[PDB]
Design a protein around this ligand. Structure first.
Ligand SMILES: Nc1nc2c(ncn2[C@@H]2O[C@H](COP(=O)(O)OP(=O)(O)OP(=O)(O)O)[C@@H](O)[C@H]2O)c(=O)[nH]1
Ligand SMILES: Nc1nc2c(ncn2[C@@H]2O[C@H](COP(=O)(O)OP(=O)(O)OP(=O)(O)O)[C@@H](O)[C@H]2O)c(=O)[nH]1
Ligand SMILES: Nc1nc2c(ncn2[C@@H]2O[C@H](COP(=O)(O)OP(=O)(O)O)[C@@H](O)[C@H]2O)c(=O)[nH]1
Ligand SMILES: Nc1nc2c(ncn2[C@@H]2O[C@H](COP(=O)(O)OP(=O)(O)O)[C@@H](O)[C@H]2O)c(=O)[nH]1
Ligand SMILES: [Mg+2]
Ligand SMILES: [Mg+2]
Lengths: 428, 426, 25, 426, 428
């Protein structure tokens, strides 16, 4: 009667997937076989005799990431029929992940999620998980989103996409993939969150005093954000902010639905010994201009509407005190046509930490999702990264060679330019 | 006899009214299992005002839990005194009005308004002659301010001559949640002024001022926060359920507090309120209680009384106390604060005495005041409103559900007219 | 349901619930 | 009845009330736990003068202990008998005005003054008609001299017709702490001379001078100096609460000691003050105690009265006495020491015999003498001011925070006309 | 509640704070882990269930000492982000510490003192321990006063400066650093005192009668004089005055904020045996001209204001008796325009003794801060040493090519010279 269907498409979509489900499994107390030794009904079903199957679907046209979890440790945790392994990769092509080999796999995906949707009536939304800088994570995610808009047109879609970073790239045609994707992403996503990779990297530096890890805590840090956002659905709370209100509470216009995110505290055992973690400073560190997961300096950006989920032993009274000091301090500018812009949702359950992980046990934590006009500078350096690649038609030869028509890139550039001028007229 | 039917709506309302039944049941002598202990005829001679006999010897409250989020009354069931309500008075919600006045009033405002009106009639005509309708709700939430307000409309169009009142909380000046506050408040205040006999105003952080300064509390809770609003909620009707030297009625207050039919907003206080450093050395006498109704720090509402003049004030005393320095204590506070009172009404203050003190105490009083201090809150939500219309934001997801631009404009043509008739009377 | 946000720091009467100097004589 | 509302300003004021309230409570037979013991009618016959009933049988002092640093009344509360006061009467400052007149009076203390004004009229208006206000403070520090005279200044306007009883501890000549002594002292005294009806001058080393030379105290602390002045407050207000052969009150002192309104600064002696080696050797009678009264060695103002003429004199006799010898024993001190009295007032005297002494003693005296001996103290705080002021001393804080050069010049004009008037009457 | 934050610029400043914080650990009875087995709130915050962390920041550019604090026994006493270290030395350059290698570390230390200050309200000020002749202690010291004064414009500052000493200097270019430091020290600090090294060296040579101590023996004396200065903020006393009273009682003009210091007694185990340390005795010894901590004879100067802190079993009569005998004495000369030049604060809690140090257990003690016109010759010899060094460009070429133009040297000349004319005009 109350659930959310999660879709994880793309190579980074699977890796952010199994980090989220390893966190949710130990959070619910359920096991990698499915059974414990009514909060589970928002992310899992019943598999008959007391077992539980996740409400997920994994999608990737290239098989070595799908069979990796089919052979790994969560073999019989997942139902083995939504682990939709394809045949061959899209190879950093939006065009190949949307036109050539997508049509033979979205028939299997929409038929599976049709059965996933009808297991309970009262579905709340979708959890898209993809990387937009690549080919099959962006292309097949866009193809699957378009079918979701025309079939389930009244349901929210919560996109969690890994937007490419200003420096850390590890591809070439990210300006070609991200500019082409974000037009059809704009009118088909109800609510979306940006995640630039190197923003997690620098907060791993200053907050976690680790020099260089691998992708495993790239994904565990994000998975704690997903856990805290949907903990209002899952666990009982003092003031619950569900998805069906969070969609309609932060989004001021039908087109500005791209938001940043931050999480505090992300603190190791090095310095959990040294400072108290109370709301009067966790909110300050969450609003600290180098702590978000997008690397979008909001000092020249301009805040519009913010969402805070306090999880743990949190009273609303020191929440009100801590948000009042945010309002009174000058370094955070809220827009002149929105004086109050704040959410205070309270959950009783403190956040859980993965065993053997780099996080530390904290009493309380705030999850931030905020809409700001700062994000115009994120998409404007995509404009500068793309306009001189397209200036004399680099890499377009095989984008059109599969059967795509020249000139749709330029009207997509009209859509990005329409998005930049929209962000300017919002802040003015 | 005469029975008040209680409607309880919103997440804020279902926690406020739960503490209301937690404080009325244990002062009337009813255990959470429904039985009675207390061996007093004063607690039993009028128990039908709020309760009903179940032919099993227990009392089921005449309360209607109503909400579109299914977790709020889930916590009511799990909480203490959570086995009093009949499950048949419960009406649930699954789609949820998500902090949204528009979808809570029309879209899911239809398939539940037929059932919550079914449950209110067979709690209404099942008695001999009912009296009134108390409604606890919020003007900050979506389903507490939209879905409960459609209930206000449907109750009156069936029952046009009975009294009814709303113990409604309001959006916050200083620290505000549920960011469409003026949208939820002002689209509801039109229906409050044309379709409600009394509306009593509660501010959340004015209650924070109660626990900070007059209570010396470090970290209080919603249990206490709703407890000090349920003390005055008890006090407005305890003189109905109990005898007294000068008894009183909700309609007794209504006739001689509301001057003119469109202004009926009230300023609710409660005395005494003590700390560990305010209980031992403090005299509990009526001249000591005189200053606590007329204390801005002892006020449950954000409106500063010193920035206005009281049109008509009233007090509901309780306890073993002489009725006269009710009234010369109300006479000298009128004479010293003559500039704090309106001049064209002689003897503004109303007095009434109930002969049952609050349980565990010796004396208390519940203050109700029609005052021109209330426009402070009515103008900050007014110009918080006007900042959300000169650039059209946050309401396109109201127009998508039917709430087009027509009704928003006269929601302000009646709101600034409401405060203009307020200021033209001073 | 972990009613900590309703955990009473008050009692039946309204109030609330229960939580050097070297003097020169 | 007649009631005294006590206000303590500064660290000196809170400590001097942390000894006066003890010596007046055991005089009333009150335990630290507020319960009376002593089975006497006379102690409870006037207890409403300095205490208020708490509807529990326990009496709370009508004091307001107040300054800008929390360490002073935390040590009062932790100390014995300091529990008697309300935390409501305690008002707290956290930043603190440090030895600064200007920011005590204008910027910092005015932030706190609107809340301590609330608690002073509550102790004032709570009775039918007050006798007066007793404010004890010192003229050396910042919060007790700057904002201490701010509350002296403002209680003049809302309460003009009632008496203004003040104790002030003036700066010390030879060894003074708190380097800006005359800037605090002279800038306070002008507000202290047109807003206070009578002021008593207590000096620090004159309290020491009584300790070393007449009490023979080997070890006096601040508590030993504090007893000497606490006996002075106890004697001057004894006849209000306790009967006698001849009544006396604060206005009784005022109309007989002030002939001209600009001069109300009083000398205080206290008798008997025995060294305990000779306590068992000293006879106790009126003709031996009167010359202990009229004595420079028993002066808690450090001015030799032999360098001046007594303008007016009075004596609050106390104890089981003979009220003939109440008065020819001061007839003797007038017709022998003829030059030590003014000439154009014949019969300079007032005896005021009060029947009940302090406990154990059969005789006691506080002495109030309006004399031109205080000329030496006002001149000395004047040239210590002007030697500093001629070279712009310690002043850029005072000017930078809400004052200017002009205000200090009339501070010395109404300092200098006090000396010029006392030479007119010399 | 109320708190005060210490900052430690320079190696000398951090080593002063090293003996300071081990002394405060003894005073409040906390172990070097921070956990006790509410008077400590002005120096220590809270952490967990019983730990306390100092409100101090250890700021150098050299890592050889800051990392050595982290490696040593007092590791977890300090929060690890409060100890900020750079990359390479200023190396006795005011140019390096203020312009070139300072810009990457002032912004980091400003963040740490930001997060250390907003934890509670009721701050009195800052206590900056620094040297003068060092490049880091003058360079980062100058920029830290420049940034803290412009945003915390109403809060006091306590620049405890280790000024260069007359006979020994143990540096070559240190007269250049001293004149440049006072170019910006005058307009940015509120209270500053001079603690010359050989004045302290002379103290420990004829009071301890030890002839080859080390740096830690002097830093124990500086720790004792800071602890005796701020004991009013911590322990209750009969007459208590603190940082607000210093800013308004000892600096009668806005531009004279240079003071001396002394202590009494400084006695060993054998010297505690053979005298009782009466209050009058420990005031005459503190007022001895050889007992001053700046090689600054007041015999040929006039005292301007004086302040003494009596700690222990002091009684309020003999504080007045010792002051009375000082007034009667003709050797100590006062100033004509200040007839009442004495301030004091008495406290009950005696100064603790480090077990294994060099002090002795005393019943009572005297701290001293005294403003006088006797610092005129202290800076007039810094004038004379700078004259013959700045005749023909000694070491100027590496200050002028590495961050500043030539002319800041000349500007520092009339800034210190106008302080000499200020000292001359006050006395006459
Ligand atoms: N969050 C997260 N992002 C990743 C991870 N690995 C790669 N990325 C980002 O994803 C972008 C490219 O997408 P891919 O990870 O290759 O996945 P894809 O979009 O489906 O492309 P394919 O390799 O064809 O499957 C790169 O630019 C990386 O920045 C990861 O482990 N976690
Ligand atoms: N009292 C005292 N003085 C010290 C101490 N350490 C160094 N000094 C003084 O500092 C001077 C040497 O310069 P430093 O202060 O060490 O230089 P710095 O502040 O570290 O600046 P950089 O050397 O560039 O890093 C010497 O003349 C000493 O007098 C100490 O531990 N105690
Ligand atoms: N006094 C009180 N106020 C509450 C309580 N719960 C919520 N509120 C206030 O109501 C506002 C949110 O209203 P909400 O509960 O979401 O209304 P809903 O939309 O009907 O669920 C917040 O600003 C809170 O200040 C409660 O239990 N007691
Ligand atoms: N009688 C008395 N005088 C005191 C006491 N403490 C300090 N003094 C004197 O008052 C002066 C300090 O005044 P202070 O209390 O600090 O004034 P404040 O700063 O305004 O509170 C000193 O010079 C002392 O001589 C005390 O306990 N009793
Ligand atoms: Mg891949
Ligand atoms: Mg160095």
């Amino acid at each position: 009667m109350r659930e959310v269907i999660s879709i994880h498409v793309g190579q980074a979509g699977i890796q952010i997937g199994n980090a989220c489900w390893e966190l949710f499994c130990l959070e619910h107390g359920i096991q990698p076989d499915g059974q414990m030794p009514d909060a589970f009904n928002t992310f899992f079903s019943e598999t008959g005799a007391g077992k539980h199957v996740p409400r997920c679907v994994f999608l990737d046209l290239e098989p070595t990431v799908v069979d990796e979890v089919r052979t790994g440790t969560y073999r019989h945790l997942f139902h083995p029929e939504q682990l939709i392994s394809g045949k061959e990769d899209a190879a950093n092509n939006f065009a190949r992940g949307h036109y050539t080999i997508g049509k033979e796999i979205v028939d299997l995906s929409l038929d599976r999620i049709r059965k996933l949707a009808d297991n309970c009536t009262g579905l709340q939304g979708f959890l898209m998980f993809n990387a937009v800088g690549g080919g099959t994570g962006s292309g097949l995610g866009c193809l699957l989103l378009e079918r979701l808009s025309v079939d389930y047109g009244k349901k929210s879609k919560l996109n969690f996409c890994s937007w490419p970073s200003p420096q850390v790239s590890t591809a070439v045609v990210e300006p070609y993939n991200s500019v082409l994707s974000t037009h059809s992403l704009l009118e088909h996503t109800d609510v979306a969150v940006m995640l630039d990779n190197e923003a997690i990297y620098d907060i791993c530096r200053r907050n976690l005093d680790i020099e260089r890890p691998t992708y495993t805590n790239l994904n565990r840090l994000i998975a704690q954000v997903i856990s805290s956002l949907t903990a209002s659905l899952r666990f009982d709370g003092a003031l619950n902010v569900d998805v069906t209100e969070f969609q309609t509470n932060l989004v001021p216009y039908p087109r500005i639905h791209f938001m940043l995110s931050s999480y505090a505290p992300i603190i190791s055992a090095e310095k959990a010994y040294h400072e108290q973690l109370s709301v009067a400073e966790i909110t300050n560190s969450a609003f600290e201009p180098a702590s978000m997961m997008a690397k979008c300096d909001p000092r020249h950006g301009k805040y519009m509407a913010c969402c805070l989920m306090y999880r743990g032993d949190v009273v609303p009274k020191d929440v009100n005190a801590a948000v009042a000091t945010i309002k009174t301090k000058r370094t955070i500018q809220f827009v002149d046509w929105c004086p109050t812009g704040f959410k205070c949702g309270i959950n009783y359950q403190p956040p859980t930490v993965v065993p053997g992980g780099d996080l530390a046990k904290v009493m309380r934590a705030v999850c931030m999702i905020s809409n700001s006009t700062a994000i115009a500078e994120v998409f404007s350096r995509m404009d500068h990264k793309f306009d001189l690649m397209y200036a004399k038609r680099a890499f377009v030869h095989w984008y059109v060679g599969e059967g795509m028509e020249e000139g749709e890139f330029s009207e997509a550039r009209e859509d990005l330019a329409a998005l930049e001028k929209d962000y300017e007229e919002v802040g003015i | 006899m005469r029975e008040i039917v209680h409607v309880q709506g919103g997440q804020c309302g279902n926690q406020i009214g739960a503490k209301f039944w937690e404080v009325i049941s244990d002062e009337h002598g009813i255990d959470p299992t429904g039985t009675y202990c207390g061996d007093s005829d004063l607690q039993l001679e009028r128990i039908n005002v709020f309760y009903n006999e179940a032919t099993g010897g227990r009392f089921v409250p005449r309360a209607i839990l109503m909400d579109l989020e299914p977790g709020t009354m889930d916590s009511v069931r799990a909480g203490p005194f959570g086995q009093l309500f009949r499950p048949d008075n419960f009406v649930f919600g699954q789609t949820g009005a998500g902090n949204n006045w528009a979808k809570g009033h029309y879209t899911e405002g239809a398939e539940l308004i037929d059932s919550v009106l079914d449950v209110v009639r067979k709690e209404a005509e099942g008695c001999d002659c009912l009296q009134g309708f108390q409604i606890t709700h919020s003007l900050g939430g979506g389903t507490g301010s939209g879905m409960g307000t459609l209930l206000i409309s449907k109750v009156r169009e069936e029952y046009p001559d009975r009294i009814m009142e709303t113990f409604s909380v309001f959006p916050s000046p200083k620290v505000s949640d549920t960011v469409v506050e003026p949208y939820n408040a002002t689209l509801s205040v039109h229906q409050l002024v044309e379709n409600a006999d009394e509306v009593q105003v509660i501010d959340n952080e004015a209650l924070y001022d109660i626990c900070f300064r007059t209570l010396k509390l470090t970290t209080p809770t919603y249990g206490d926060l709703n407890h000090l609003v349920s003390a005055a909620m008890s006090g407005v009707t305890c003189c109905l359920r109990f005898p007294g030297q000068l008894n009183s009625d909700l309609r007794k207050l209504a006739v001689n507090l509301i001057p003119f039919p469109r202004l009926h907003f009230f300023l609710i206080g409660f005395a005494p309120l003590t700390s560990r450093g305010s209980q031992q050395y403090r005299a509990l006498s009526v001249p000591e209680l005189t200053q606590q109704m007329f204390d801005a720090k002892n006020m449950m509402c954000a409106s500063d009384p010193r920035h206005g003049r009281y049109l008509t004030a009233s007090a509901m005393f309780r306890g073993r106390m002489s009725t006269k320095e009710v009234d010369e204590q109300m006479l000298n506070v009128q004479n010293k604060n003559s500039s704090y009172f309106v001049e064209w009404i002689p003897n503004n203050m109303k007095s009434s005495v109930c002969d049952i003190p609050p349980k565990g105490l010796k004396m208390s009083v519940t203050f109700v005041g029609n005052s021109t201090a209330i426009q402070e809150m009515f103008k900050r939500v007014s110009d918080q409103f006007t900042a959300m219309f000169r650039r059209k934001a946050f309401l396109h997801w109201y127009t998508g559900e039917g709430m087009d631009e027509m009704e928003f404009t006269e929601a302000e043509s009646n709101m600034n007219d409401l405060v203009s008739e307020y200021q033209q009377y001073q | 349901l972990y009613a900590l946000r309703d955990h009473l720091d008050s009692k039946l009467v309204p109030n609330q619930s229960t939580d050097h100097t070297n003097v020169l004589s």
